């Protein structure tokens, strides 16, 4: 079941040694444990999620989200509704 609340940034997007990105998100909604809504948009990209299907284990919990973002300009959407978090990423 999908999370339906506010997800704030705990630690910002960062490139890893193994050429991937990681975000650490705090979940501020209810219904937790729940699947974290993750969208990778281009300038909708499929199967670029490295992490094992991310979940918000409890409210106030932090979650590591490993992605393989496309080259260049990409947009990561964490969550749903007007509380969704759109993140702009650039990959060289």
């Amino acid at each position: 079941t999908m999370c339906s609340g506010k997800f704030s940034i705990d630690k910002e997007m960062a490139e890893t040694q193994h050429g991937t990105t990681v975000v650490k998100v705090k979940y501020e909604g209810a219904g937790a444990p729940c699947k974290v809504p993750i969208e990778i948009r281009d300038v909708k990209v499929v199967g670029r999620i490295i992490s094992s299907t991310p979940f918000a284990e409890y409210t106030n919990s932090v979650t590591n989200i490993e992605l393989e973002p496309p080259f260049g300009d990409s947009y990561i959407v964490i969550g749903v509704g007007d509380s969704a978090l759109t993140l702009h990423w650039f990959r060289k």
Partner: antibody, heavy 117, light 108 residues
Framework: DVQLVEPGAELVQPGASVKMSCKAS????????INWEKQRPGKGLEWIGN????????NYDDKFKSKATLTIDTSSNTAYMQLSSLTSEDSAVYYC??????????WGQGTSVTVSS | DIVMTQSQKFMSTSVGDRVSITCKAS??????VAWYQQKPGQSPKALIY???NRHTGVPDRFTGSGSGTDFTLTISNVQSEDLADYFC?????????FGGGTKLEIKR
């Protein structure tokens, strides 16, 4: 010519903390990740975690979260690992290495830490 | 966490013979597998990067093969200097995990 200079050995008291250095040279330091590994005698290798000079980006292996602190001094091209509240489980050979998407390539000489009063 | 299973703990080979050091991944790590040579009382030396690619200044005796879960390091024409500890490492995802190690003995 890549060179990661690591002090040979360090004698630490139980419960005390140690700061060990890894002096890089021979390459663009601020453009490669630094790795740190643990090697207990007759036992295998363990990945402590990694640092990125050109951003200060850190990744730790949860096993070492409360134990290791990875700092970097770009002005001295030295990478550091601080191990805290030492126990005999911490007596091991600590390595530092250059990182990339090819991983470890050039390993330093390793500090042989010994925990005893 | 991914577990690198280097089953071969000890291996004896006469100079000139062929040896195949196996490594098994707990899950699909793709090709993000490196091999290292650790000669007694020395730092590990990088041999193979990304499962099959030999590093600079590594003899063509050293060969890497495989993908996913089965990875092998092959040393054809064994030399007296080849006397070391050999290990695989995954860098597919954090935390980076190492093979058990394989102490290669040289038969004489």
């Amino acid at each position: 010519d890549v060179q990661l200079v690591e002090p040979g050995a360090e004698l630490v008291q139980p419960g005390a903390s140690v700061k060990m250095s890894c002096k890089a040279s021979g390459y663009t330091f601020s453009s490669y990740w630094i790795n740190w590994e643990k090697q207990r005698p007759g036992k295998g290798l363990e990945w402590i975690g990694n640092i990125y000079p050109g951003s200060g980006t850190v990744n730790y292996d949860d096993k070492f979260k409360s134990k290791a602190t990875l700092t970097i001094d770009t002005s001295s091209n030295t990478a550091y690992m601080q191990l805290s509240s030492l126990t005999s489980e911490d007596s091991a050979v600590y390595y530092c290495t250059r990182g990339g998407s090819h991983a470890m390539d050039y390993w330093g000489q390793g500090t042989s830490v010994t925990v005893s009063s | 966490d991914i577990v690198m299973t280097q089953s071969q703990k000890f291996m004896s080979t006469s100079v000139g013979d062929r040896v195949s050091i196996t490594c098994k991944a707990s899950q699909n790590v793709r090709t993000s597998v490196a091999w290292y040579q650790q000669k007694p009382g020395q730092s590990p030396k990088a041999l193979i990067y990304l499962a099959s690619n030999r590093h600079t200044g590594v003899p063509d005796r050293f060969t890497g093969s495989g993908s996913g879960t089965d990875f092998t390091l092959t040393i054809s024409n064994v030399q007296s200097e080849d006397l070391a500890d050999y290990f695989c490492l995954q860098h597919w995802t954090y935390p980076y995990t190492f093979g058990g190690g394989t102490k290669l003995e040289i038969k004489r």
